[PDB]
């Protein structure tokens, strides 16, 4: 008889005052972080070629 829940809300339109305020899922949206350390580990690299590459 028993089951858990399985459906992923990716976008959300909540009918915000007519013409729903649709919005995606923020956490579900992927995003990367630029290596600012490696960004600062490249130019100063003695191989300024390797680091700038």
């Amino acid at each position: 008889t028993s089951e858990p829940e399985y459906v992923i809300p990716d976008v959300l339109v909540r009918k915000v005052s007519g013409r729903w305020t649709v919005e995606l899922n923020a956490d579900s949206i992927p995003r990367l972080k630029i290596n600012q350390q490696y960004a600062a580990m490249g130019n100063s690299a003695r191989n300024d070629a390797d680091g700038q590459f």
């Binding site: 089951e3 829940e5 399985y6 459906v7």
Partner: protein
């Protein structure tokens, strides 16, 4: 709460220190009955299955 008549006197093993000995009348007299209500629910869950 409410007045029920009572008397202070030891008697017959029902009164060691801390027993309260009321007789059958209030059980007939309903004096202090209880009525308690816990909540309940159900859910629908339009599923993948």
């Amino acid at each position: 709460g409410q007045n029920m008549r009572v008397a202070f006197m030891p008697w017959n093993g029902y009164n060691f220190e801390d027993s309260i000995l009321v007789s059958e009348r209030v059980v007939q007299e309903d004096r202090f009955t209880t009525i308690h209500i816990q909540e309940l629910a159900c859910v629908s869950r339009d599923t993948k299955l």
